[PDB]
Structure 1
């Protein structure tokens, strides 16, 4: 099964905060699972996420032997093999391709209105059921209030 995970500010801007807690959530949800990303996302991360299989989506040839390079959405899924759940880590463009096939979403709603580039694709209220929610305020470490949510395709 295919799963998308994203950290969204207000108005689904994914495109200012310092949320160690979210990185803690992100890591635990992805550990030991294939991670699919677009080249731009790969580029900002800058090194492979240790303990996951890293699959990069690009139209051109791979430039780094530390991850697996693929040329289509289909090949990306084939590269994962037989695992229970595949995690789509972004960005915008990969979100939009993967959304229609995703069965689960893992979101963090950050209270931070920013003017941004990429929005998380609109998902239909009707296709999703929230099966987990957990609200947390800003504290020492975390700069903003945020909410962990998990949705499932009904």
Structure 2
């Protein structure tokens, strides 16, 4: 199975503050849905709680070592090894974070689905320093700020080298 990680980072690799996203770009969230629909998504307990419910059309796998932790509609696993197994016989698995999971999986990541948001904001969670490794961009698309999305952002699909 291909190990991919998807995230949206503001400048300085910021991805969150107070267990929430420091911005609101509905069109970017639709890009997230587009990139994960039909695929198993693996996330940390904090990220699952920030989302507030399982995401439709995807196998929701949540990581937590609290043995009695079991929200409705999601599969809970106690280790990353169990998350992969839980994903099943699929072609690609999507690590949807949070910083904790990105950190642990970066070294093993095959692809990074990154959205760079042109914004400098306060944060308490950051995406790992992926540039310490070698990647080659496979796809990209720039999205100018608009009516319902007040920030410019750029999508970049990186493949590990």
Q: TM-score range by the shorter chain?
A: over 0.9
- Cα offset for 1:126? 4.8
Q: How many residues were matched structurally?
A: 154
Write out aligned runs for 1:80-119 (5 A): 80-119=87-126
Q: Would the aligned equivalents of 1:17 and 1:143 in 2 still touch at CA under 8 Å?
A: no
Q: Deviations over 1:10-43 (max 9, x none)?
A: 0101124221121111011100000100000000
- Tell me, yes or no, if structure 1 residue 12 matches structure 2 residue 13: yes
* C-alpha distance in structure 1 between counterparts of 2:11 and 2:72, whole Å: 37
**What SS class does the counterpart of residue 52 from structure 1 fall into?**
coil
RMSD: 1.1
* C-alpha distance in structure 2 between counterparts of 1:141 and 1:124, whole Å: 31
* C-alpha distance in structure 2 between counterparts of 1:125 and 1:151, whole Å: 13
- Tell me, yes or no, if structure 1 residue 59 matches structure 2 residue 65: yes
Write out aligned runs for 1:2-151 (5 A): 2-15=3-16, 16-60=22-66, 61-124=68-131, 126-151=133-158
Q: Residue 146 and residue 75 in structure 1: after superposition, are their counterparts in 2 closer, same or farther (change >3 A)?
A: same
Structure 2, unaligned runs of 5 or more = 17-21
Q: Residue 126 and residue 37 in structure 1: after superposition, are their counterparts in 2 closer, same or farther (change >3 A)?
A: closer
TM-score w.r.t. the length of structure 1 is 0.95
2:19 equivalent in structure 1: none
**What SS class does the counterpart of residue 32 from structure 1 fall into?**
coil
* C-alpha distance in structure 1 between counterparts of 2:103 and 2:158, whole Å: 17
